[PDB]
Amino acid sequence: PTTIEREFEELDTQRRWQPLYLEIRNESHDYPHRVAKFPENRNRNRYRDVSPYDHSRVKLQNAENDYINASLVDIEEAQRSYILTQGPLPNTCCHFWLMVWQQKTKAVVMLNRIVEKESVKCAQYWPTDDQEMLFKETGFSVKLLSEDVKSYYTVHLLQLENINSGETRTISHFHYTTWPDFGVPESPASFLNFLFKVRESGSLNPDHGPAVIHCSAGIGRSGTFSLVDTCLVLMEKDINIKQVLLNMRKYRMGLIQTPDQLRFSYMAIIEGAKCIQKRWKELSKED
């Protein structure tokens, strides 16, 4: 039994998942997020209570307004860096792709559906057919090159073109489609199979820019994905998941939204620590 597995049983048998989450809530440091509250940036924020911190926000270089609701989450101890962001709005899709270009991002991890429970959580920022998607404000175009449809996720191969310079890069768009907002995946196997699919593409390696992780607000499901991956990388080199989460929350507010998402993170980390990947793929029923 590992130290993490010992802590998991103590939390479960004593039902301390909710006070542990409250502890993380109470220990979460607040940081200035003034730029996000500028009046000119109102139409760039999906939610009024979810903002990037000033010290860690991703800046749109050379634009008139450099603001995008996106946070660079660095974990120097893991040699890992992610960009967590909200689901783009119709008017910020151009900024989203400008950020992907400037940050040399190779993968976009999307953990939400476009519509969830009668509500639009994200604009359609990539094309679903062979028609080019134009973003004239920032000078980019996106084409759908290929798509690999699994039972609970789809991988879209996208071509991101700088329409001014002509340069193109290939973007891997990993779309998790069965993860409800404020909820959890179906099982640790399905989540880990998806995560290792992202890992196996090489898009998280240091020879690429930071991956862009997003859901609706960019804190809940996105926080779960990044917490498990960061803890798995560290466990490779004893980890304190609580401290890892608190340190990650210094870069973006509110990561992990429910005690159940915290509990699931523990389960995914414990199951991911055994790495079995073929076993996960079969349990996930991806095909």
Curated annotation (Swiss-Prot):
- The segment(s) forming the Tyrosine-protein phosphatase domain are 4-272
Which classification does the entry list for the species? Eukaryota, Metazoa, Chordata, Craniata, Vertebrata
Question: From which residue to which, out of the full length, is covered?
Answer: 2 to 296 of 415
- Residues that bear S-nitrosocysteine: C215
Q: Which gene encodes it?
A: PTPN2
What the record says about family reads:
Belongs to the protein-tyrosine phosphatase family. Non-receptor class 1 subfamily.
Q: Name one GO cellular component term.
A: nucleus
Q: How does it assemble?
A: Interacts with RMDN3. Isoform 1 interacts with TMED9. Isoform 1 interacts with STX17; dephosphorylates STX17. Interacts with ITGA1 (via cytoplasmic domain); activates the phosphatase activity towards EGFR. Interacts with TRAF2; probably involved in tumor necrosis factor-mediated signaling. Interacts with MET. Interacts with FAM220A and STAT3; interaction with FAM220A promotes interaction of PTPN2 with transcriptional activator STAT3, leading to dephosphorylation of STAT3 by PTPN2 and negative regulation of STAT3 transcriptional activator activity.
What reaction does this catalyse? Answer: O-phospho-L-tyrosyl-[protein] + H2O = L-tyrosyl-[protein] + phosphate
Induction note: Up-regulated by IL4/interleukin-4 (at protein level).
Q: Any idea what this protein is called?
A: Tyrosine-protein phosphatase non-receptor type 2
> Could you name the active-site residues?
C215
Q: What does this protein do?
A: Non-receptor type tyrosine-specific phosphatase that dephosphorylates receptor protein tyrosine kinases including INSR, EGFR, CSF1R, PDGFR. Also dephosphorylates non-receptor protein tyrosine kinases like JAK1, JAK2, JAK3, Src family kinases, STAT1, STAT3 and STAT6 either in the nucleus or the cytoplasm. Negatively regulates numerous signaling pathways and biological processes like hematopoiesis, inflammatory response, cell proliferation and differentiation, and glucose homeostasis. Plays a multifaceted and important role in the development of the immune system.
Give the result of R221M, as annotated. Impairs phosphatase activity
Q: Which UniProt keywords apply?
A: Cell membrane, Cytoplasm, Endoplasmic reticulum, Hydrolase, Membrane, Nucleus, Phosphoprotein, Protein phosphatase, S-nitrosylation
Q: What is the effect of changing D181A?
A: Substrate-trapping mutant; catalytically inactive it forms a stable complex with physiological substrates including INSR and EGFR. Accumulates in the cytoplasm upon stimulation by insulin or EGF; isoform 2
Enzyme Commission code(s) on record? 3.1.3.48
